[PDB]
Design an enzyme around this catalytic site. Structure first.
Site, PDB file in Angstrom:
ATOM      1  N   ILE A  80     -34.571  83.456 -99.543  1.00 12.68           N
ATOM      2  CA  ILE A  80     -35.784  83.756 -98.770  1.00 12.68           C
ATOM      3  C   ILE A  80     -35.795  85.147 -98.121  1.00 12.68           C
ATOM      4  O   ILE A  80     -36.864  85.740 -97.954  1.00 12.68           O
ATOM      5  CB  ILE A  80     -36.025  82.672 -97.693  1.00 12.68           C
ATOM      6  N   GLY A  81     -34.627  85.668 -97.753  1.00 13.81           N
ATOM      7  CA  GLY A  81     -34.561  86.978 -97.119  1.00 13.81           C
ATOM      8  C   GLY A  81     -33.153  87.485 -96.886  1.00 13.81           C
ATOM      9  O   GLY A  81     -32.239  86.711 -96.591  1.00 13.81           O
ATOM     10  N   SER A  82     -32.996  88.800 -97.011  1.00 11.91           N
ATOM     11  CA  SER A  82     -31.721  89.475 -96.798  1.00 11.91           C
ATOM     12  C   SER A  82     -31.911  90.568 -95.755  1.00 11.91           C
ATOM     13  O   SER A  82     -32.969  91.210 -95.719  1.00 11.91           O
ATOM     14  CB  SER A  82     -31.238  90.109 -98.107  1.00 11.91           C
ATOM     15  N   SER A 132     -28.445  92.002 -94.342  1.00 17.72           N
ATOM     16  CA  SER A 132     -27.037  92.421 -94.149  1.00 17.72           C
ATOM     17  C   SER A 132     -26.355  91.780 -92.922  1.00 17.72           C
ATOM     18  O   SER A 132     -25.145  91.552 -92.945  1.00 17.72           O
ATOM     19  CB  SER A 132     -26.882  93.956 -94.150  1.00 17.72           C
ATOM     20  N   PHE A 133     -27.119  91.479 -91.869  1.00 14.98           N
ATOM     21  CA  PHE A 133     -26.606  90.724 -90.715  1.00 14.98           C
ATOM     22  C   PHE A 133     -26.786  89.209 -90.914  1.00 14.98           C
ATOM     23  O   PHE A 133     -27.083  88.480 -89.959  1.00 14.98           O
ATOM     24  CB  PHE A 133     -27.311  91.176 -89.428  1.00 14.98           C
ATOM     25  N   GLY A 134     -26.583  88.749 -92.155  1.00 14.88           N
ATOM     26  CA  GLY A 134     -26.839  87.359 -92.555  1.00 14.88           C
ATOM     27  C   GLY A 134     -27.785  87.263 -93.748  1.00 14.88           C
ATOM     28  O   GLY A 134     -28.496  88.223 -94.072  1.00 14.88           O
ATOM     29  N   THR A 135     -27.780  86.102 -94.406  1.00 14.91           N
ATOM     30  CA  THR A 135     -28.707  85.799 -95.509  1.00 14.91           C
ATOM     31  C   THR A 135     -29.310  84.397 -95.293  1.00 14.91           C
ATOM     32  O   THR A 135     -28.597  83.475 -94.896  1.00 14.91           O
ATOM     33  CB  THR A 135     -27.992  85.856 -96.896  1.00 14.91           C
ATOM     34  N   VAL A 136     -30.609  84.240 -95.545  1.00 15.36           N
ATOM     35  CA  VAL A 136     -31.288  82.955 -95.327  1.00 15.36           C
ATOM     36  C   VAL A 136     -31.864  82.349 -96.611  1.00 15.36           C
ATOM     37  O   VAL A 136     -32.630  83.002 -97.329  1.00 15.36           O
ATOM     38  CB  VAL A 136     -32.418  83.086 -94.296  1.00 15.36           C
ATOM     39  N   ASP A 154     -37.168  90.166 -78.600  1.00 14.29           N
ATOM     40  CA  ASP A 154     -37.730  90.607 -79.881  1.00 14.29           C
ATOM     41  C   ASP A 154     -38.869  89.693 -80.342  1.00 14.29           C
ATOM     42  O   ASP A 154     -38.932  89.268 -81.492  1.00 14.29           O
ATOM     43  CB  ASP A 154     -36.625  90.697 -80.949  1.00 14.29           C
TER      44      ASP A 154
HETATM   45  N1  LIG Z   1     -33.931  79.296 -79.541  1.00 16.75           N
HETATM   46  C1  LIG Z   1     -34.093  80.378 -79.843  1.00 16.75           C
HETATM   47  C2  LIG Z   1     -34.287  81.779 -80.224  1.00 16.75           C
HETATM   48  C3  LIG Z   1     -33.465  82.255 -81.405  1.00 16.75           C
HETATM   49  C4  LIG Z   1     -32.412  83.139 -81.211  1.00 16.75           C
HETATM   50  C5  LIG Z   1     -31.666  83.584 -82.289  1.00 16.75           C
HETATM   51  C6  LIG Z   1     -31.963  83.147 -83.566  1.00 16.75           C
HETATM   52  C7  LIG Z   1     -33.012  82.250 -83.788  1.00 16.75           C
HETATM   53  C8  LIG Z   1     -33.311  81.825 -85.173  1.00 16.75           C
HETATM   54  O1  LIG Z   1     -34.464  81.864 -85.553  1.00 16.75           O
HETATM   55  N2  LIG Z   1     -32.316  81.455 -86.011  1.00 16.75           N
HETATM   56  C9  LIG Z   1     -32.458  81.050 -87.351  1.00 16.75           C
HETATM   57  C10 LIG Z   1     -33.539  81.397 -88.167  1.00 16.75           C
HETATM   58  C11 LIG Z   1     -33.600  80.938 -89.487  1.00 16.75           C
HETATM   59  O2  LIG Z   1     -34.644  81.293 -90.291  1.00 16.75           O
HETATM   60  C12 LIG Z   1     -35.647  80.501 -90.755  1.00 16.75           C
HETATM   61  C13 LIG Z   1     -35.941  79.218 -90.283  1.00 16.75           C
HETATM   62  C14 LIG Z   1     -36.999  78.523 -90.832  1.00 16.75           C
HETATM   63  C15 LIG Z   1     -37.785  79.115 -91.859  1.00 16.75           C
HETATM   64  N3  LIG Z   1     -38.867  78.651 -92.550  1.00 16.75           N
HETATM   65  C16 LIG Z   1     -39.401  79.405 -93.463  1.00 16.75           C
HETATM   66  N4  LIG Z   1     -40.543  79.143 -94.245  1.00 16.75           N
HETATM   67  C17 LIG Z   1     -41.035  80.024 -95.177  1.00 16.75           C
HETATM   68  O3  LIG Z   1     -40.466  81.060 -95.411  1.00 16.75           O
HETATM   69  C18 LIG Z   1     -42.286  79.835 -96.005  1.00 16.75           C
HETATM   70  C19 LIG Z   1     -42.230  79.035 -97.305  1.00 16.75           C
HETATM   71  C20 LIG Z   1     -42.956  78.468 -96.082  1.00 16.75           C
HETATM   72  S1  LIG Z   1     -38.497  80.909 -93.505  1.00 16.75           S
HETATM   73  C21 LIG Z   1     -37.404  80.397 -92.248  1.00 16.75           C
HETATM   74  N5  LIG Z   1     -36.377  81.034 -91.706  1.00 16.75           N
HETATM   75  C22 LIG Z   1     -32.565  80.172 -90.008  1.00 16.75           C
HETATM   76  C23 LIG Z   1     -31.495  79.831 -89.202  1.00 16.75           C
HETATM   77  C24 LIG Z   1     -31.440  80.270 -87.889  1.00 16.75           C
HETATM   78  F1  LIG Z   1     -30.388  79.932 -87.111  1.00 16.75           F
HETATM   79  C25 LIG Z   1     -33.768  81.809 -82.688  1.00 16.75           C
HETATM   80 CL1  LIG Z   1     -35.090  80.705 -82.892  1.00 16.75          CL
HETATM   81  C26 LIG Z   1     -34.626  82.772 -79.109  1.00 16.75           C
HETATM   82  C27 LIG Z   1     -35.712  82.321 -80.086  1.00 16.75           C
END
Ligand SMILES: N#CC1(c2cccc(C(=O)Nc3cc(Oc4ccc5nc(NC(=O)C6CC6)sc5n4)ccc3F)c2Cl)CC1
Ligand SMILES: N#CC1(c2cccc(C(=O)Nc3cc(Oc4ccc5nc(NC(=O)C6CC6)sc5n4)ccc3F)c2Cl)CC1
Lengths: 263, 257
Positions: free
Chosen positions: B16-18, B20-24, B129
């Site tokens: 889904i996204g890159s 360098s400070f992690g990959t998702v 942010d």
């Molecule tokens: N609590 C908290 C906070 C915080 C601090 C630090 C990190 C996070 C965080 O987000 N971590 C995180 C994020 C992540 O990224 C995500 C999560 C859900 C998601 N859904 C997606 N859907 C789509 O792309 C479309 C097809 C429909 S993409 C996607 N990516 C993954 C793991 C994390 F730990 C967060 Cl929420 C301060 C806001």
């Protein structure tokens, strides 16, 4: 690692009914919240145990299909605060307003419930009272499994129609098991596919208990809607098996649904 | 309380996204999940600390308008598991595919966004942010605040731009970010779109010569909303309202509508 909500912050509002132990209200705490609280002067040691047990169970869960627990309070009353659900329970949809779901959705509500039950079981939680009125259909699209008791509308007749035969009989001090839950799920599946509750043709409550226990009475599978896939009907059959060891666990179920969830 | 997910349970799927400070990736763990991983097998100290810090923040949050943390894993690679959001981010709706929300909906999006920021601040969490891409409009209905980055000046407040102290981030700095989000919602565009130079924007916002053009707000945007927007964007930090007031305002605004 704290979830106590300090006193004075929760604004208790409307009043919804009665929970597992206490009384559920609609409230306000960082938005709309559900508040179960023991409306008493002093908790009994047993009551306070219930509270501790429930907070202990909810704080283990973090899943889209399980009621979001947000925090608790003990300062004036004992009180559990969860997210507030908008819409109504599956029971209400299927048997009160007679909502008219397309099979694509009926299967989805099934899939989601299956996800949540798989999760609970993963964390060694046996629900023990799964039934359609404990499945809130949030925003009309998102199962949220709760333990409401009387927060949502109450079932026909404890709650007989979802109890697996061994649960009914009560041989053991504890007949509840991952498989007792699977039978419950099996009846939920029956509701979804038939649109009805089981055993409509019997008015006597004791007779249903007696017969379902003896394995003389079983849900009438011929009542499932004709556009219900044979996979889903066959799966329903396997969840409703009378011998508990012969019932599948949820990993299997989730697979089975995810499979037929194409075409 | 333990959220460590046993190994070989998460099934990693599509990428889904890159950054360098992690990959998702998108994954399967009791239904759909999002999985943030670390590529390199043998990790560094700075890498491993950020994980513990991120997991530490996430595990403190249980609210409908914040991305639901579900678990972590370390026993093959470091990985953080949250819920999987269906739909698109606010940024994507407004600036990429240019969705036209009706005014009642935009207000609501703002209401929920503030509702979550209230929650975070209550738990002494400064986001640092906030921006439209970090708001996810889950199932086109529920706002889920997150942090999907792997800087972004347009949402950065003056005192942050000027790097005053080692810490200039405050609840008020997030409130500014929120103001810029309200601008996006009401104008439908990003600010300073008539300027192509980043250094100049930094210098100019920093010195207080530049601020978003509130003349561009939709005609049917309420007077109360334009005013709240102005308050949240006040160059002076102490003048900006906190999120309890903002909610109080937004909610009153929706009542007469
Ligand atoms: N609590 C908290 C906070 C915080 C601090 C630090 C990190 C996070 C965080 O987000 N971590 C995180 C994020 C992540 O990224 C995500 C999560 C859900 C998601 N859904 C997606 N859907 C789509 O792309 C479309 C097809 C429909 S993409 C996607 N990516 C993954 C793991 C994390 F730990 C967060 Cl929420 C301060 C806001
Ligand atoms: N963990 C766990 C489980 C568990 C074990 C024990 C207790 C509970 C539990 O449910 N606690 C609980 C329940 C509660 O009941 C609720 C929650 C939301 C809600 N929304 C409603 N909406 C409406 O009526 C429509 C007008 C809009 S009514 C309502 N009631 C409240 C507090 C609880 F702790 C739960 Cl979820 C297995 C899932």
């Amino acid at each position: 690692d704290d979830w106590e909500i300090p006193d004075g912050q929760i604004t208790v509002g409307q009043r919804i009914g009665s929970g597992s132990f206490g009384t559920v209200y609609k409230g306000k705490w960082h938005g709309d919240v559900a508040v179960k609280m023991l409306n008493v002067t002093a908790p009994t040691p047993q009551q306070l145990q219930a509270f501790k047990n429930e907070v202990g169970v909810l704080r283990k869960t973090r899943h889209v299909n399980i009621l979001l627990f947000m925090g608790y309070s003990t300062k004036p009353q004992l009180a559990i605060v969860t997210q507030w659900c908008e819409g109504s329970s599956l029971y209400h949809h299927l048997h009160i307003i007679e909502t008219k779901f397309e099979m694509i959705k009926l299967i989805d509500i099934a899939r989601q419930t299956a996800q949540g039950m798989d999760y609970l079981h993963a964390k060694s939680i046996i629900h023990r009272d799964l039934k359609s009125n404990n499945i809130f259909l949030h925003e009309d699209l998102t199962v949220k499994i709760g333990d409401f008791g009387l927060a949502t509308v109450k079932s026909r007749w404890g709650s007989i129609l979802w109890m697996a035969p061994e649960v009914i009989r009560m041989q053991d001090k504890n007949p509840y098991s991952f498989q007792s839950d699977v039978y419950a799920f099996g009846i939920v599946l029956y509701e979804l596919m038939t649109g009805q509750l089981p055993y409509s043709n019997i008015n006597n409550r004791d007779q249903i208990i007696f017969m379902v226990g003896r394995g003389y009475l079983s849900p009438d599978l011929s009542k499932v809607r004709s556009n219900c896939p044979k996979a889903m009907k066959r799966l329903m059959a396997e969840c409703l098996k009378k011998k508990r060891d012969e019932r599948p666990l949820f990993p299997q179920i989730l697979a089975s649904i995810e499979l037929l969830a194409r075409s």
